[PDB]
Amino acid sequence: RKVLISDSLDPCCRKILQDGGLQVVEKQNLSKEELIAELQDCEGLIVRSATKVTADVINAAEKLQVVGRAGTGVDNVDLEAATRKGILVMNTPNGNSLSAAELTCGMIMCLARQIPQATASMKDGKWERKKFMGTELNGKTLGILGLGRIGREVATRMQSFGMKTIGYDPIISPEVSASFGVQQLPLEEIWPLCDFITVHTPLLPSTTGLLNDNTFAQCKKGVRVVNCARGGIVDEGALLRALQSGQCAGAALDVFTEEPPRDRALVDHENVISCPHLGASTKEAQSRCGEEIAVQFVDMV
Amino acid sequence: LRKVLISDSLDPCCRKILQDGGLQVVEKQNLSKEELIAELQDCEGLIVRSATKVTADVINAAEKLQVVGRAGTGVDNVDLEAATRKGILVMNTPNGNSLSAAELTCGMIMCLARQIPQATASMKDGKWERKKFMGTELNGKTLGILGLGRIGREVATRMQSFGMKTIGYDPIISPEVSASFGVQQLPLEEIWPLCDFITVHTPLLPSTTGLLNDNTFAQCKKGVRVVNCARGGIVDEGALLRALQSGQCAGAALDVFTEEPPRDRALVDHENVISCPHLGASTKEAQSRCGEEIAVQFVDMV
Ligand SMILES: NC(=O)c1ccc[n+]([C@@H]2O[C@H](COP(=O)([O-])OP(=O)(O)OC[C@H]3O[C@@H](n4cnc5c(N)ncnc54)[C@H](O)[C@@H]3O)[C@@H](O)[C@H]2O)c1
Ligand SMILES: NC(=O)c1ccc[n+]([C@@H]2O[C@H](COP(=O)([O-])OP(=O)(O)OC[C@H]3O[C@@H](n4cnc5c(N)ncnc54)[C@H](O)[C@@H]3O)[C@@H](O)[C@H]2O)c1
């Protein structure tokens, strides 16, 4: 059939599809009405995160058969509406892991030394040595919640800095985590030990507010936290209260409960470092995800 | 060997160690030239960090002064020539800062790969600009490390954990020794074309002033990224600006400048440059270690 790529993807996605004999239309930044119009001659749609595959789009897209997302999860696809119609939804759980792990490590280093703030200071003409006294990562404890693809890659990188890496994952055995140097403990034992906490779980009811007022209360005063997973795993209201009291000394956020976020209190806080969901924003990750999704479209004979 | 003036803001452990060694200590900070010379009247020892400027005039007016200690690397704020001519010993702390400087360098590499400082600035300006901040994955990329001493080797082993190939050069470290911490030595001319990132960890010497310059930038890959958390002037600042302006250099991270604070703002102002006010040693841990390291030398002196 014919596939529309409605967001900006690596050009290899397009190449692999055509090599498989498919018509492609590559057209970014479509309005809701433009998207529906294009799709009515299309059985495939491929998105990244910008296009919102809502029930209304799906319902109006009568010939649609498969929606592919070139990223993890299905955050911008109404999976329930797609399933109600006969529509397959596919994604790319492997292609961007390494890039996400690397950003998470960068964010830890940025929290330790306040590099983003120091650059902003310098650009205002300031030379603020005292303000930007930091902390050394060597000897500190990093808590890693979620020890799948990304969590284990964060662990081995941060171990090279001399960090003690502890963590928790309901599915990963202690024996598997020991093989990448992560000691598992129950959550209640993790909180008071950590200098830094990073989350690498899916977003589920059980992981929403994984860090919240109750768990911040149990942390070491001055804990630094990273969320490069999904918005909401760290409760944003709790995080702001923790930053306000000094219970959390800083946070680094790639992701938000709303993207772009309309509430600016966290982004605007002096001790918060942020990015516009750049975890998979590398040429390499994008090349890998574009291939991953294209191959899945070709493999359906 | 009796009274020591500590003239800059140091970790309190420096004072205690001197005092345990059996020395008198005066902590006074932010002194003018005249004030510094007056405090030194009864002092045979002076301990500084970076702000106090132990110039030829101070050295020559300070009558009982026998040793100057700097709680940091090199002798940037001490006229060592003047000191040596008058017979005054100068001591510094070559070990205490290594790990904090290595960590900052690695943080700078990550920031250049993913534009985290620029991304934060954009978000704080109320923007959501994903495409602009498309970055580079470190795995498989080549990092060139010039200077393979205390800091170079620590940077190498950390960036190796990211899957970077670490190559470099040091005139005194043998290829066999550098091999033992995973750094492949090659001649400089073979390095430039191979590097995705270059980081410098040398002293500032005639051999290292302008080690990166217009000619070496022309030998590099289009889009090379450069880090200087060592000393200002190892990367020629004019050459670096020209390379940033043409795109030969995709970005640079600078902790150090030929003038500090720098009066010329062109590099700091460039959108592809990330910077810090010489924070390589600016951690609680490093400052503690340096404070200990310099007081301990003074006490052995007794
Ligand atoms: N910021 C980005 O651009 C970016 C990029 C890629 C992935 N991600 C996100 O990062 C997260 C991790 O991705 P991954 O590829 O490593 O996923 P993965 O499935 O390999 O691993 C996730 C792990 O989380 C664990 N988990 C579930 N509930 C948990 C809980 N309550 N406590 C601790 N662990 C729990 C699972 O057991 C699993 O092992 C996901 O949310 C993913 O969407 C973000
Ligand atoms: N930004 C900061 O706050 C900060 C903090 C600590 C140290 N430093 C600086 O970082 C630099 C490295 O310090 P270190 O402790 O690793 O020093 P080190 O003495 O242990 O190592 C320096 C190495 O540079 C090498 N070298 C000399 N000339 C060279 C050349 N032409 N090419 C390649 N290598 C050359 C030497 O042979 C030596 O092995 C110094 O300039 C030091 O002052 C900066």
From Swiss-Prot, chain B:
Residues that bear Phosphoserine: 9
Record keywords: Acetylation, Amino-acid biosynthesis, Disease variant, Isopeptide bond, NAD, Oxidoreductase, Phosphoprotein, Serine biosynthesis, Ubl conjugation
Residue ranges of coiled coil: none
Chain positions recorded as NAD(+) binding sites: 73, 150-151, 170, 202, 229-231, 255, 278-281
UniProt-annotated catalytic positions: 231, 260, 278
Chain residue numbers at which the record places covalent cross-link Glycyl lysine isopeptide (Lys-Gly) (interchain with G-Cter in SUMO1): 16
A biological process from GO: G1 to G0 transition
Glycyl lysine isopeptide (Lys-Gly) (interchain with G-Cter in SUMO2), cross-linked positions: 16
Phosphothreonine: residues bearing it: 73
UniProt keyword GTP-binding present: no
The family this protein is said to belong to: Belongs to the D-isomer specific 2-hydroxyacid dehydrogenase family.
Subunit structure: Homotetramer.
Name by which UniProt lists this protein: D-3-phosphoglycerate dehydrogenase
Organism: Homo sapiens (Human)
UniProt lineage: Eukaryota, Metazoa, Chordata, Craniata, Vertebrata
Positions spanned in the full protein: 6 to 307 of 533
